Ligand binder design. Structure first.
Ligand code: EMS
Ligand code: EMS
Lengths: 377, 378
């Protein structure tokens, strides 16, 4: 059993607060994209595959303000971030690399690498909380030749961007100095964009300048309500690019140019409204959750980054997260118990619950009312 | 380098006859699906994921006449046949099994499995030509714990269905008797449907009844012009189903319900016209290729099944498929050399060329005229 199987069951329920996938409806301007889907289809039929790859990649890294990625122009597209992760797994296995992986994190990252026989060892997120302790903690704790981070992190919303540039600079300094491969999953990085103090800087400038061996994964699926018709992106350092390219081409020839055409519309639309239609739904549900559960047995854990998931600690002398999950699901509200996010030792997660916020606000507000009723015993 | 990289280049060219992916345009009735994409979007948005999975799986296995698969109801959906193959690869790696794999076959099957460190040993397609020799030839030549077939085969269009039920029954008898995991890629099986003598029987009835350990992969992307917005299916025998299920859920939670809803309309559309809009385009291009190249240095290899690719032998004392590819691409026509389809011994494939038929027939006819003009000055 894993979180994905919990999410399969939650997808049959009205109050599904489990999977982080986007289930809010379309904004007014996004309904305009839906209306042009026939034109987007016929356009992709007549044009060249590489044109739609280029236009998508350009729009994506323009919105994310990663100009270095567009100069190097070596990013590869796949169906989903887990597929990019499997390509990384093939590289890890070829090079006999074991991975020190962030904990907590969503469990399928562990599972898919473990299912490829990649040796995996945890490193706790708290190693990154104090910027001046990052490098010595990594020197003491990382004993593999690859380090896999998720930033911003799922489920906590933590980000090294709390430290400006310096948190990432210290991680990169460690990996370069010690000849480590740095893997980073940026799937939640869109939730930093347009933030006054947290907006992501050009990561690819730092990765390229440092000369570090790296694999960087980006995603669309958590940001936009595209019903999992999505694209992920992977970028490799120059010294491993050829090997990773050949691995990637064994998996797929191309992402659908129709999907790429459509996603480009969503990226451009969010450039125009500075991600308002994404951010506004999350803010309404996040605030509704905080206000409803303030003072309850579910203690909100404020995230560094306003990501699409909310993380709660269970404050009770006897009840665990397993009990809370059972009590809520009995009344029709499905959350994820924290145990699976502590993939190296699930018992560490029996004090946490994750709730998805990428939801229609009316349904979400009714889910919170029912949740509060259950927790009131 | 491999065939997919050849196909990346061909996608930039006017006469791309390389990748088997579908590039013909929409039929009149398929245009009515495209016109309803907004409706199909809102349906999936408001409906349940399991609803669109169920309706797609039902439509697919009704068209393919595999009712046993719907009774068992244990099939898992993924983004593409290669993703299903990687799940099978993870199973093969967990069990530390070596694979005997059909040769020739499209090279990314070999590459995906090799990139997961699965040991791979070839078995030539000719072992399946004589139905009464299949079992003793497998006894001699399958000395691994798994056997991986592609049926109908890509690039040759060969199928055990030439033997009715008996070819598959002999393969399954061997694998059951000798404790072999049987993997079968059925991605080209749509091209057998509604054929008076070749239409596929219920494969899952045979696989289930025999009790063989198996993994079976099905596909939509080679059949319909859906611009690679597609879905593959994998089904496992009962004894390994739980392990394979857990591997599969580590890869993805769900295929887009919008894509599933759209694909369901294409499946239903082709049930309505008995796949005529697919078959007629392929037949037009197949016949154009055959007539155009008759008597040339490219010798047409008639396939058992009318699949979406055509296979030719290079009939020349010196020129190779690599030479032919070089000469044709210099004039703008991009075909695939046979080399990488002979994944264990690529030089064997320098005797062959593959051409994709899932193309607009006007472009294709222009491509053949240019192809023969290039060939006849050599
Ligand atoms: C930071 C991050 C994720 O949070 C995440 C997925 N998180 C999920 C969904 C789970 C889907 N389950 C599987 N992919 N097996 C969540 O609920 O948090 C993935 C994988 O993305 P995708 O499913 O391949 O499109 C990559 N990076
Ligand atoms: C019998 C068969 C194939 O012929 C085939 C693909 N053949 C192709 C295109 C290959 C695209 N390249 C890669 N998938 N790496 C051809 O040109 O024949 C695949 C994989 O399908 P998909 O690309 O994952 O959608 C599975 N079973």
């Amino acid at each position: 059993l894993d979180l994905t199987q919990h999410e399969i069951q939650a997808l049959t329920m009205k109050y599904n607060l489990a999977d982080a996938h986007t289930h809010q409806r379309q904004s007014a301007s996004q309904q305009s994209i839906v209306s042009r889907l026939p034109q987007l289809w016929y356009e992709a039929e007549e044009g060249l595959q590489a044109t739609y790859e280029k236009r998508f990649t350009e729009a994506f890294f323009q919105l994310h303000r990663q100009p270095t990625a567009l100069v190097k122009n070596k990013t590869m597209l796949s169906y989903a971030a887990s597929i990019s992760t499997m390509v990384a797994g093939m590289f890890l296995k070829k090079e006999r690399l074991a991975v020190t992986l962030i904990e907590p994190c969503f469990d399928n990252l562990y599972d898919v690498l473990a299912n490829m026989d990649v040796p995996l060892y945890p490193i706790d997120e708290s190693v990154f909380y104090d910027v001046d302790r990052i490098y010595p903690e990594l020197e003491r704790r990382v004993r593999t030749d690859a380090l896999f981070l998720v930033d911003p992190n799922n489920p906590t919303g933590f980000s090294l961007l709390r430290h400006g540039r310096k948190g990432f600079e210290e991680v990169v300094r460690f990996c370069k100095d010690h000849d480590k491969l740095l893997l980073i999953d940026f799937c939640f990085a869109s939730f930093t964009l347009f933030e006054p103090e947290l907006a992501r800087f050009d990561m690819y400038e730092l990765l390229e300048n440092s000369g570090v061996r790296y694999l960087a994964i980006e995603d669309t699926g958590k940001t936009w309500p595209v019903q999992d018709a999505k694209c992920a992106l992977i970028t490799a350092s120059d010294d491993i690019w050829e090997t990773v390219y050949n691995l990637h081409t064994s998996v797929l020839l191309n992402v659908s140019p129709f999907v790429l055409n459509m996603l480009t519309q969503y990226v451009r639309d969010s450039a125009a409204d500075r991600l308002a239609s994404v951010r506004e739904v999350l803010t309404r549900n996040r605030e509704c959750a905080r206000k409803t559960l303030d003072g309850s047995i579910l203690e909100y854990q404020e995230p560094v980054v306003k990501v699409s998931v909310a993380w709660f600690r269970v404050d009770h002398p006897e009840l665990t997260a397993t009990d809370v999950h059972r009590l809520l699901s009995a009344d029709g509200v499905y959350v994820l118990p924290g145990r699976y996010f502590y993939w190296s030792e699930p018992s560490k997660g029996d004090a946490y619950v994750r709730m998805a916020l990428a939801r229609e606000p009316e349904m979400f507000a009714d889910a919170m009312a029912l949740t509060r009723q259950v927790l009131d015993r």
